[PDB]
């Protein structure tokens, strides 16, 4: 049909020119002897037109376009905001023998019996990862290919990452499918959202610190307050550690505490506030606040517990 061709054309137009050959080689839909016939030296439009002609001369189904979209998304993986889930299991349950075919079958059958029209595409890659692309629909509409949902599941682990695109309408259904296909009982959402998937992976798996101990100049200038400088340096080094900080970009705090400072002494109601910290590389600008003279030597525990508590959004009450 024409919808598949339009989907493939849009997906190819999204791909840059310098890395298009790698994506086309990873797709492995067109034969290798058909790639050298196309000249990647001319304009992008002519190359895309020739590729569309080649993909139309051959039988192009809807699964190949979904696989190409999955490949592009897992190659970029920085265009969406990612959230984390956590699944719990009962005390009397034994360790299960994970099987990929049964997992795929259950995850497909749950959505096929709940809804009517829904597209599911799988991709099993090493690092023990399963990428799932879901196109949603119902009994009276066709699956919408413009707003897909991406899920990254790690086998035999209680964690799973998801792209927050449209699952706000079908969140309980996706949670049920995940907790049934993986043989679990409960599921909850963690207060940890971020655009950097590798940072979330390192924080959730708490493997950002990989250092273990094992045995196998112008004297005319007099710097005063040097003891305070060495003290604040020691405090910063002890609080923020010495490992490379994970890369975050946002933090949010909600405050419902009372104002304590003659001024609003008779007030018995809290002061509602919402504070947002934004930075290209968070946890690295804060570490340089105390030596620069903008904050005290020990920072507030609310700012130095981001990777340890695995939390990004905070609520504080009186």
């Amino acid at each position: 049909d024409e919808t598949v061709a339009e989907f493939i054309k849009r997906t190819i137009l999204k791909i840059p020119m310098n890395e298009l050959t790698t994506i086309l080689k990873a797709w492995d839909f067109l034969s290798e002897n058909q790639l050298q016939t196309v000249n990647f030296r001319q304009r992008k439009e002519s190359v895309v037109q020739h590729l569309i002609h080649l993909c139309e001369e051959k039988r192009a189904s809807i699964s190949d376009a979904a696989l190409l979209d999955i490949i592009y998304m897992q190659f970029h993986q920085h265009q969406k905001v990612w959230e984390v889930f956590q699944m719990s299991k009962g005390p009397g349950e034994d360790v299960d023998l994970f099987d990929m075919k049964q997992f795929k079958n259950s995850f497909k059958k749950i959505l096929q019996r709940a809804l009517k029209n829904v597209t599911v595409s799988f991709r099993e890659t090493e690092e023990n990862a399963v990428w799932i692309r879901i196109a949603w629909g119902t009994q009276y509409t066709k699956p919408n290919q413009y707003k897909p949902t991406y899920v990254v599941y790690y086998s035999q682990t209680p964690y799973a990452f998801t792209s927050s695109s449209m699952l706000r309408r079908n969140t309980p259904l996706l949670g049920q499918a995940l907790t049934i296909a993986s043989k679990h009982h409960q599921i909850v959402k963690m207060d940890l959202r971020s655009r950097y998937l590798d940072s979330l992976k390192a924080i959730v798996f708490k493997q950002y610190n990989q250092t273990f101990e094992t045995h196998n100049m112008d004297s005319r200038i007099i710097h005063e307050n040097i003891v305070e400088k060495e003290r604040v340096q020691r405090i910063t080094q002890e609080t923020f550690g010495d490992y490379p900080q994970p890369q975050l970009e946002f933090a949010q705090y909600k405050l419902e505490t009372k104002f304590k400072s003659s001024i609003l002494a008779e007030r018995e109601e809290p002061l509602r506030c919402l504070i947002k910290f934004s930075s290209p590389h968070l946890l690295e600008a804060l570490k340089s606040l105390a030596p620069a003279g903008i904050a005290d030597a020990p920072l507030s525990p609310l700012l130095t517990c981001i990777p340890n508590k695995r939390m990004n959004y905070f609520k504080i009450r009186d």
Binding site: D218, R220, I221, I222, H223, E224, N225, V227, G293
Partner: protein, 172 residues
């Protein structure tokens, strides 16, 4: 503790200056610009954040005090206002200077110039302007400060700090 100008005896051809401010990098750059040249005297530079200083006896006598005020932050203004209460009046007789930084970029200024003008006029002290981020102006400011320090230290026969107080007096 209160700092006093004439607590100790002077050294042999030695002049000492003290720089009080919140930004340590600017103070370090200013000290480097002051000491990068050669003069007839032996110069010494001390750096501090606020007053009073940590107690010590080894510290020689101070000849000049410069208060650096950054117009882009009220924290430095509050720090200077707090530090101005730990020096005796006898030090304000031509041995104290104010240096305002950041007047070039008016869009970044958070403090009006009238505030620092009135602050300098209240304590009867000169007021200098310089953008310490640029090296070309910082070198000239350092040379001027070195000359003022040499005048205040007593290395110029016939001119003292009390005379410099009358030389740099403003009409209004």
């Amino acid at each position: 503790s209160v700092l006093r100008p004439l607590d100790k005896l002077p050294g042999l051809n030695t002049a000492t200056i003290l720089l009080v401010g919140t930004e340590d990098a600017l103070l370090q750059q200013l000290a480097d610009s002051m000491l990068k040249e050669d003069c007839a005297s032996e110069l010494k530079v001390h750096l501090a954040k606020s007053l009073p200083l940590p107690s010590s006896v080894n510290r020689p006598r101070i000849d000049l005090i410069v208060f650096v005020v950054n117009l882009h932050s009220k924290y430095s203004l509050q720090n200077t206002e707090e530090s101005l209460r730990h020096v005796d009046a006898s030090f304000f007789l031509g041995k104290v200077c104010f240096l305002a930084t950041g007047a070039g970029r008016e869009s970044h200024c958070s403090i009006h110039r009238h505030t620092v003008v009135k602050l300098a006029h209240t304590y009867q002290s000169p007021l200098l302007y310089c953008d310490l981020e640029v090296e070309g102006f910082r070198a000239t400011m350092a040379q001027r400060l070195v000359r003022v320090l040499q005048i205040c230290a007593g290395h110029v026969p016939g001119v003292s700090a009390l005379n410099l107080l009358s030389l740099l007096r403003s009409s209004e």
